[PDB]
Amino acid sequence: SYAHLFSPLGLITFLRSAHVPLNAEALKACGAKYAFVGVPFDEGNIGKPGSEDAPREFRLITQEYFSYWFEYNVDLHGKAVDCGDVSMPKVSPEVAHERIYRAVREVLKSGLIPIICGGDRSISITAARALSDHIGPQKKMGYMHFGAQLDMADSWAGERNLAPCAMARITELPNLDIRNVAHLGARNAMNPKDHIDLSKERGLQYDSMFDLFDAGIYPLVERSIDRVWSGTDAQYLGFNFNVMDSSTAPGVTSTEPGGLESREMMRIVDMIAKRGGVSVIDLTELCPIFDISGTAARLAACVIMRLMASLAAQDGDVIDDKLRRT
Amino acid sequence: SYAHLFSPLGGDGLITFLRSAHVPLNAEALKACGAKYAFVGVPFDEGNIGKPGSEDAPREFRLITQEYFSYWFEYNVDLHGKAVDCGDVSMPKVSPEVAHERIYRAVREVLKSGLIPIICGGDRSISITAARALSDHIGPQKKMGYMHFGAQLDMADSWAGERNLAPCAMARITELPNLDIRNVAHLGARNAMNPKDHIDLSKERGLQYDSMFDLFDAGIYPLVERSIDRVWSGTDAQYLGFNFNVMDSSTAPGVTSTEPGGLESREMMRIVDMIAKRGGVSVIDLTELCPIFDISGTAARLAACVIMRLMASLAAQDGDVIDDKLRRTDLV
Amino acid sequence: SYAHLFSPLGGDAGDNYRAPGLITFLRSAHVPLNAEALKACGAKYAFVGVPFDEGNIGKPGSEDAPREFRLITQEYFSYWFEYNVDLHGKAVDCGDVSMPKVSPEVAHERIYRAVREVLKSGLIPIICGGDRSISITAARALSDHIGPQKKMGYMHFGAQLDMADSWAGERNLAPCAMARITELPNLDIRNVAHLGARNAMNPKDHIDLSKERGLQYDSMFDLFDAGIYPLVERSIDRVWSGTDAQYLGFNFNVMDSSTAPGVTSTEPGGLESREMMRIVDMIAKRGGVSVIDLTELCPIFDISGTAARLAACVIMRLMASLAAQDGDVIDDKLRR
Amino acid sequence: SYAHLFSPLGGDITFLRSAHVPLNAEALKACGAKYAFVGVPFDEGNIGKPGSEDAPREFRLITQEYFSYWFEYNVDLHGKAVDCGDSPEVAHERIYRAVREVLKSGLIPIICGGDRSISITAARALSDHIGPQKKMGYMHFGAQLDMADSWAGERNLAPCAMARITELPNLDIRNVAHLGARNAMNPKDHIDLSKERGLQYDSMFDLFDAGIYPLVERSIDRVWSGTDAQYLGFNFNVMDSSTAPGVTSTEPGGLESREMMRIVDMIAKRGGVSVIDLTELCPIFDISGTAARLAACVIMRLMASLAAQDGDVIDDKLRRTDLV
Amino acid sequence: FQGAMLDRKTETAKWQFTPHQHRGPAEQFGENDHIYSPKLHNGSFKSRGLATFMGAPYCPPDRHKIREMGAKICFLAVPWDQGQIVRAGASQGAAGLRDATTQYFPYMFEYDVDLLSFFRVVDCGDVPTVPGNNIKSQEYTADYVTECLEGGAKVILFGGDHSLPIPGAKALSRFTGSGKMGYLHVDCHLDAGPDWAGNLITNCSGAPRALDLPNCNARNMAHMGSRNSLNPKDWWDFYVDNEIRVVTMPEMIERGLEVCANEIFERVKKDTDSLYFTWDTDSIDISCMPANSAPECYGLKGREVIQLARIAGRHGCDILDIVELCPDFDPSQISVKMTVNMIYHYLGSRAQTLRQQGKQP
Amino acid sequence: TAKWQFTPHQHRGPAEQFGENDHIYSPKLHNGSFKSRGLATFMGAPYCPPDRHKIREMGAKICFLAVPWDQGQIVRAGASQGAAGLRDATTQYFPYMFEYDVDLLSFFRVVDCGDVPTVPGNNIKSQEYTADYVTECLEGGAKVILFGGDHSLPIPGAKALSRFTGSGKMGYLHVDCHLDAGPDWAGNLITNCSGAPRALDLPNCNARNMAHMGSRNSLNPKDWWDFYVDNEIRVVTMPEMIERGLEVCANEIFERVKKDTDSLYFTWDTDSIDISCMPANSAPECYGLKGREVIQLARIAGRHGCDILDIVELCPDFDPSQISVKMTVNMIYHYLGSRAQTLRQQGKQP
Ligand SMILES: [Ca+2]
Ligand code: NI
Ligand code: NI
Ligand code: NI
Ligand code: NI
């Protein structure tokens, strides 16, 4: 019952959790708070290939961990379920995105928090739209994304829903006020001038990595947290782990030097969790073929699990300190 | 001869730690050889419940140390002749009780000589036997200190019905009769490989471990200095052990169980100088290196630099420096 | 003692501690590079590592071949049931030749003296290289060792002719190797064989020079047309008949890329593993060889050690096949 | 539904994506399948490099890269198999009963992963299942004889397998075949013991000299003629290293892939087999899944070839334009 | 009119290359230096520098520029790998291919041919892609291939995925006009899905799309190399229903490569004016070609790949395409260098045949 | 007569783009080379032969020149593959840097001058080629980015800058985990561990304008340290950089090496960078610069400016990721971005 908290007496799923189908009734009844949804889709990727294999590698990494986090006095066992991968045809991106949209809507309908582990960054477009529709036109949405790239291409090669377009599409959602949008970590030269122009035209208040360094990081992060969470009914949190310094995130689609180090992101996770809630969590652009001994996948897995544990600690959902190995 | 300090001149095999001489594992031979440290390889992994690989760590560690000179310009110290290599303890492969006995005799024999064993292991359970050997070596009238770096507390009273596997190490080590808990330091614990009974047992015994969170919040060095003082003040012997998963995964991938959010290499180097300021240590171990997972030998290279810098910094603190007026033109 | 022929007995103790040792060819004993200590050790072969790659005009990596080659050979038992031969004690390892970096003239002299010393002992040097140019020096050492009144034979397996009279203006780089070796004064071109040449790393001047000198190389296309073994047998006969010493050299890019991926310059459409094994047996029927070399193994390109393992089996089966031909077999009646 | 035979139409983890049926003899007999895949991730008999522990999982995943339809045979493997995938002492007894229960159902167990010592227990379970009044045959492919009477003082490790399997009372030595032995992983006591017992092994050298197939044909006949049940085991280090890197102990100078496929058809001519095993796959050493892909294609081709031999083919007139 | 204002009709292209690449003070200038050991330096045998395919001149894919250079072979990379039903990766093939040509001379002693000057090879660069848009990316490929054909050259097309023969054969069919076109498909996989999840133009439909062309007839089509069960029934039904000859790998092995290949080349060329030859790398055994999206055992061996390339060269084709190479899956060079030799032996055998007939390319 | 011409987003043919500034914007007709590198030069810049007359006709103010020579190397080969990894890594970026608002390509009229040829086995002749080639870039009126190859590169590199500086004075900055100051290595004066003594030998390079930054650990024989003590050349070890702060240290050092000089040679070994960020080295080392510090040092260098920047010892075959090659791209890009931002602030041209 609680034996998994202690030293042992002697499908591939996220955290070795149970599989529940993508069905709202089964999800509400299963008792979990999060629903892991794999999206092995990479046909919005304009860069090097590889992110299609991220959901499997991410899952395999998470099966190595215990569920109890002594730093938070929190047990993750039973807090998540795994709904498998969204079923999507190849060479038909429109249908694939509709499948993603219906999968995210079904999770949101159940009341659980989807954890969307992607192939490419364009899946965030559809996931964010699904949340925007889920809460409806009478609600306010917030959106915070971590990444080295603004992804503010109004169009790219004449197309409108590729990975470098994601933020340009997401900031057009009707119940997402731009003042409730945060983007943290932009740096280096994979940011063409029209992305900056479009950001200025729309009032996108991105926190560049340089901006973050100058402020000591955390005071500026706290201010953007406040913009995303104050006065909004739902919050979307997304990660491209090329926001991290290349040394701790080599296995990503477009790795970037001069970013966040692991202890800094762990602090940011705790700052986010103080708001006591999040509506969707995504992670995209992990690229196992470029990884170094699974370093990027393991960093990603550690951030997601600490985020779950930190939210539970904030909610008071900790375990009884009096439990003993019995 | 001083030619090993300098670039080779023109016209001019054994795999050992720092290209140092081999001396048999014999107390009499070790005392007479003149070294201060005796490196002992212990390729034993049958206390390991995680991914395999630490069995090959001693050889890869030895090979990495041969990429470096013995001279440390930062300290004006020459490590040449300061260590010797005693080879490996013979691992019979199916008698953990017997293997630990051979390890116990090996450490007692090195300690009897007065040299400092540098014990390079397979899995962390090797520390149980080495720490017991030191405790028995100093006897019940002496005080022992103990410091370990690692992401895991290893405070399982029992694990899968066993009492001496790697996750049980600290639970056994803190039972030693001449190791007061106030002289015990554990630095770096973090993340989810620390079940509740490891924390419950640590609280029951008063183990004031310095978690990674504790370290970061204190700026690292002020808290490390306090734990150094607890381990070295008033003790007759000190045991220093490393699991290099104390380091951030980015800088030590080749370890048995890598963990994000750990020490930077520059932080471990300063800590090494802080330890060396106390001017002595009785036993040094490093366990859980896992070369099959390493990239460009990163973890092995980091471990070698930490250990050799410790030797160099101890020599500098001791004033055991070389004649800095020496020049390469003196060889000709 | 013969327990090494049989399944390990296990349950054995008393070793207590293992002295630090050296990674050695075939887990064999280390003997210094000294002719008398070599003559007295009882072995027939002396493995010599040559981690030298400053004659390489292609992708880097062969510097690490001697280490990876040795490590592969340490996985195998010494008894070969196909030949009833025990390789234990038949070889020793002399370590690597000591060579300075960025000083190829000195490096080659160190190689020359090393091969001369092993030959002086009467043992067969097995020279595991970095790059192909080390064969120039090794073959010259054999030519000097036998002297001007004796006849030398030379056979090389490789995808490349290496008949550059000069390359980038230089005369002793890897692609020049055969052009230098075919200049040796006691090596008649009629006693020279080169087998396996194929594909486009063979510029026209290598072909012109070969024709100018009468080098009858057996191209891979020639071998296929002949069913391979009939043509190999004739070149074996040219190299061994009427010669006092024979030099046998391998660039394992002679092998099909599928079975030698980890080489400096891998080549499709070559020999398969079972074919090289028959060729090895054909060679051993001549009952002797003076020098064996292998160069241009490239571990950074290998796939699960495939090329290094192929080379190891070729070399060990050659020793085993020579021993069987010599009658140096094991007593069948030996039991555990 | 037959839709699985064709390219998916627009709109809209087990071996071969087959259904799971519990490891229970009655449930297996009623499910309608002919094979029961059993993963056995056991590596406590392995004396070499580790990795065979993960073989059952990677084998399953590789088979999901293929369709169930074999155009070379007009055979559909869909529904012919189901998946039953799962302290050395009790584990071997658990393996024994797992094989006994599948055999009790009448299905053909396909025993995957783990080190070669598992064949000892599966062969013992089959020998007990048929009883003392029937004759058993055994065929194994591998580079190693595994004829150690004992190894490091043990008697049930991987190098002891053939010494144990050939002691079964209903295994006449003339009904035993071992194909592919070569190179130096064969100590003399393994050869001497083979001579003592009359093990008529076909070394790789013997196979090449005979053109392979004439010799394979004779050993097949020795295993299948006059026997009531036949056990077939694969260590894919029988294959040339170039085509099977991801194995425990790879060896150069072995069978090409095209030669094995032809051998598979030769075995399939006999119209039946009692147990199929594969051991010593080692995925951590694999590149592009080469060993796992070869193993998958051999086992599935054997199933497809057996179905074609039995006449168990599909209606070749079915077309994709029939799906509703 | 933007086209006219931007183009330079009166600036003529020159076919010019430096033997062994490097210019500057140590540039070599000998007319034939590229077929001999390098003289002043190492060329690009160790360090790739700015290498084109074979070191050939770059020529923009422009019919007038190609004809001005007199190029008779265009190398054109088509890295598009998002018409792919298996997995991405073939977008990296062309870079590994070009880099691997630095490991060779453009001279083949097995045929005594200088490939570069015999054909006046040019490297036409890469076809651009529109990510996520298979339809538009294939429209680009056909228009680029059309420029090479209209420039008077025969074409080596180097892929990403096997959607390539769809625009490839479309361009050749259009160029062939009222003449007849043959189509040869060499592959482990039958690649004859009528559609894949409703999509007609993925990398599993090259053969049906070719048969749809107005001047490509079933009697001039053929497939070689198939085996194993990544072959849904409808792919095999296509060949049965349309009477298109399939030579499976078991048949090639039993009858002999030379006999089968010569018969097939006679069939696909009988009464045709042109031939499209598409060659998937997974036809090659996985032991020789691990770097593929769908690598397969029971395939061509290394020496047989070169044999088939030679035989193709004896007969000749107007477009040769080679697809699905994924160099990132291979820690060795075996796969990229296999693809170099497919092209080099094809061209070497083609030149030897033309010269033997007293014909020019 | 040479013309400086490039196609935005590389590809010509029917879908070629022609906008004068298209290279700083999201591609319009296609994906450019972000996925498939095609025929990529450094930064997509025009190729220009290392020829003073062509370079000057193009008006190029920055020449990228690869020096892949890796056989003057005392550790292990591999750096001959660096320049290819670098060029390929620049396809992952635009030539526009939003952190500086600079179009690097048109600001400097960057050209790619190809590779310096090598003579395998002949360190003397290969270094002579490097000096001859570097000289053509300098005489063409350009400042130079030299990409190694092993750290023998500053020997011919600084000789060419020294000759070009004539009667003026040259400074020399060496950033490295290793002191690289062997008087000789096994009798050889010009291996990759002698950049600094060979620079001090130059008639117009004085000790007071020389400096070394980044050293630590024990791949540093005593004669390498004795060189700096005996000639009074300031060394700033990595521990000092950490204790005092990179900016303070770097600014002090750039002031020293530039004081009263007419030109500056800046050689930067990638193993100054911590092994966690830079595994692709012949001799990768812990206790080095962190990723954000590398970019900081490149910006600081760009503020002060140098005549030749060289970056050596990158071995991409040792790295399964792109982190090492992309680190070297950012070293160069942030140098140039900061240099351009400074020039534009000063009202000066490159
Ligand atoms: Ca015009
Ligand atoms: Ni295909
Ligand atoms: Ni295919
Ligand atoms: Ni340096
Ligand atoms: Ni350095």
Side-chain angles (χ1 to χ4, degrees), chain A residues 7-8 71 262-263 293 321, chain B residues 160 191 196-197 248 267 293 295:
Chain A
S7 303
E71 292 168 281
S262 62
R263 72 182 66 168
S293 282
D321 55 315
Chain B
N191 301 335
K196 185 173 190 300
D197 59 296
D248 196 70
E267 292 162 340
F293 292 149
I295 296 84

Side-chain angles (χ1 to χ4, degrees), chain D:
Chain D
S1 160
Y2 297 128
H4 62 272
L5 297 179
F6 307 104
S7 304
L9 295 162
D12 316 319
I13 303 167
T14 59
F15 167 68
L16 265 168
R17 298 173 294 256
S18 62
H20 169 59
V21 176
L23 200 60
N24 170 268
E26 192 184 9
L28 286 169
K29 184 179 298 178
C31 75
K34 302 186 165 181
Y35 307 81
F37 183 87
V38 178
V40 184
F42 167 88
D43 72 342
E44 286 170 338
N46 174 38
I47 52 91
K49 290 298 172 176
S52 67
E53 187 185 5
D54 298 314
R57 171 174 275 178
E58 291 303 309
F59 186 75
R60 287 181 175 99
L61 288 166
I62 282 298
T63 65
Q64 300 196 192
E65 307 275 342
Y66 297 96
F67 277 72
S68 59
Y69 171 77
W70 284 74
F71 81 99
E72 302 171 40
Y73 300 96
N74 190 38
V75 161
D76 183 14
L77 289 187
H78 181 267
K80 293 195 167 50
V82 289
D83 199 328
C84 295
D86 280 9
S87 305
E89 304 70 12
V90 171
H92 276 282
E93 261 301 324
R94 296 207 184 186
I95 297 166
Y96 178 86
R97 292 192 179 182
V99 182
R100 288 297 305 267
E101 189 76 6
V102 171
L103 290 172
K104 176 172 163 164
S105 74
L107 276 60
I108 299 165
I110 302 176
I111 307 161
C112 177
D115 70 277
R116 202 256 173 115
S117 75
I118 301 299
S119 301
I120 304 170
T121 303
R124 181 167 55 95
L126 179 57
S127 170
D128 292 339
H129 177 267
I130 67 174
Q133 270 57 61
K134 297 305 208 176
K135 296 182 59 187
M136 182 184 61
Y138 180 92
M139 178 169 293
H140 180 84
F141 294 80
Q144 296 152 278
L145 288 168
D146 302 316
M147 281 288 282
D149 190 62
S150 73
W151 184 285
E154 298 285 310
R155 298 182 63 86
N156 293 291
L157 302 176
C160 307
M162 273 333 250
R164 300 291 80 83
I165 291 170
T166 54
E167 292 162 359
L168 293 168
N170 48 10
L171 182 58
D172 197 307
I173 193 66
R174 286 183 297 104
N175 304 125
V176 182
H178 187 293
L179 301 93
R182 62 183 185 280
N183 300 336
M185 302 309 284
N186 292 285
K188 185 171 188 300
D189 60 297
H190 298 206
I191 293 292
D192 293 338
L193 186 62
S194 295
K195 267 100 196 97
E196 183 182 318
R197 295 182 178 189
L199 173 61
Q200 303 169 325
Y201 62 85
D202 305 305
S203 71
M204 194 66 63
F205 178 92
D206 287 341
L207 286 161
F208 290 157
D209 210 71
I212 299 181
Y213 310 124
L215 184 53
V216 170
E217 178 61 31
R218 290 158 70 205
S219 296
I220 288 175
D221 197 59
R222 286 192 300 101
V223 174
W224 269 265
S225 292
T227 58
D228 299 78
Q230 304 82 32
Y231 189 118
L232 175 58
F234 294 99
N235 187 339
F236 283 99
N237 74 357
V238 76
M239 313 295 299
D240 194 69
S241 58
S242 56
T243 188
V247 299
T248 297
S249 186
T250 195
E251 291 289 8
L255 292 177
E256 291 160 1
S257 59
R258 64 178 61 170
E259 292 161 341
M260 180 58 86
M261 298 310 175
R262 173 151 165 71
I263 292 169
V264 158
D265 282 337
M266 298 173 63
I267 292 167
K269 279 173 199 184
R270 299 316 174 113
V273 70
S274 308
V275 177
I276 302 175
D277 95 63
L278 60 158
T279 66
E280 303 290 10
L281 282 174
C282 193
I284 184 68
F285 297 144
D286 223 344
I287 283 81
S288 283
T290 292
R293 283 178 158 83
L294 177 85
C297 293
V298 166
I299 302 298
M300 291 183 306
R301 177 176 298 268
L302 179 55
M303 301 167 65
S305 198
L306 285 162
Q309 177 66 32
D310 192 52
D312 186 358
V313 299
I314 59 138
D315 184 11
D316 66 334
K317 304 168 72 60
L318 271 177
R319 294 305 159 88
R320 185 166 178 266
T321 54
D322 299 335
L323 303 170
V324 174

Side-chain angles (χ1 to χ4, degrees), chain F residues 4-148:
Chain F
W4 187 82
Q5 278 164 351
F6 69 92
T7 299
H9 296 296
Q10 188 188 140
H11 306 310
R12 307 201 54 201
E16 180 173 355
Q17 290 185 215
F18 292 91
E20 194 251 286
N21 296 129
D22 278 3
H23 55 290
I24 77 176
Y25 297 116
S26 310
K28 296 174 166 88
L29 302 180
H30 53 73
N31 201 51
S33 56
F34 290 101
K35 178 185 301 283
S36 300
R37 76 140 158 101
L39 298 175
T41 55
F42 173 80
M43 197 183 291
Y47 171 75
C48 184
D51 173 337
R52 64 187 69 186
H53 308 292
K54 300 306 174 49
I55 289 162
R56 220 155 32 236
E57 281 157 6
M58 288 197 186
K61 297 300 169 188
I62 287 292
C63 297
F64 179 86
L65 179 67
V67 190
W69 180 245
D70 73 348
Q71 293 178 323
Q73 162 75 256
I74 65 176
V75 187
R76 77 211 349 251
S80 55
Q81 311 307 299
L86 185 294
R87 289 190 171 98
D88 299 1
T90 67
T91 72
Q92 306 296 277
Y93 288 105
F94 287 85
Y96 171 82
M97 296 199 76
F98 84 99
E99 284 149 318
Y100 311 96
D101 191 22
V102 169
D103 171 8
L104 304 184
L105 185 51
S106 81
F107 188 92
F108 291 102
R109 286 168 88 80
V110 178
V111 296
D112 190 335
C113 288
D115 289 15
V116 179
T118 70
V119 185
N122 192 331
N123 185 50
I124 291 171
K125 192 152 154 183
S126 296
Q127 286 185 32
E128 174 67 19
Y129 277 170
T130 301
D132 290 327
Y133 277 61
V134 172
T135 295
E136 290 309 312
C137 303
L138 295 170
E139 294 285 353
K143 287 168 176 41
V144 192
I145 303 182
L146 292 180
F147 205 83

Side-chain angles (χ1 to χ4, degrees), chain A residues 32 58 65 83 91 105 107 116 178 191 237 270 293 322:
Chain A
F58 187 77
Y65 291 80
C83 294
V91 204
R105 286 296 303 266
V107 171
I116 305 162
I178 191 68
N191 287 286
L237 171 56
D270 285 338
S293 282
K322 197 195 171 288

Side-chain angles (χ1 to χ4, degrees), chain E residues 30-53:
Chain E
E31 181 181 26
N32 292 129
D33 280 4
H34 56 291
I35 76 175
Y36 297 115
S37 307
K39 296 177 164 90
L40 300 177
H41 51 73
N42 201 51
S44 56
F45 290 99
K46 176 184 300 283
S47 299
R48 154 191 118 204
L50 299 173
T52 55
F53 173 80

Side-chain angles (χ1 to χ4, degrees), chain C residues 142 151-155 186-187 191-192 239 243-247:
Chain C
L142 178 58
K151 297 180 61 186
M152 183 184 135
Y154 179 91
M155 180 168 90
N186 50 9
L187 182 59
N191 306 125
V192 176
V239 173
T243 55
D244 302 293
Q246 305 81 30
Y247 188 115

Side-chain angles (χ1 to χ4, degrees), chain B residues 89-160:
Chain B
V89 191
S90 293
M91 287 309 127
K93 289 262 174 175
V94 252
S95 345
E97 181 175 347
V98 169
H100 279 284
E101 289 162 8
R102 298 205 186 184
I103 298 165
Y104 180 86
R105 297 196 314 255
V107 182
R108 288 296 304 267
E109 185 75 6
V110 170
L111 289 173
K112 175 172 163 164
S113 75
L115 277 59
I116 298 163
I118 303 176
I119 305 163
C120 181
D123 73 69
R124 162 78 182 303
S125 75
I126 299 299
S127 302
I128 301 172
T129 306
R132 182 165 54 94
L134 181 60
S135 170
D136 292 341
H137 172 64
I138 67 175
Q141 270 58 63
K142 297 305 210 176
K143 295 180 127 284
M144 183 182 154
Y146 178 93
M147 178 172 281
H148 180 83
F149 293 88
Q152 296 151 278
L153 293 172
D154 300 318
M155 280 286 282
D157 189 34
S158 72
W159 185 284

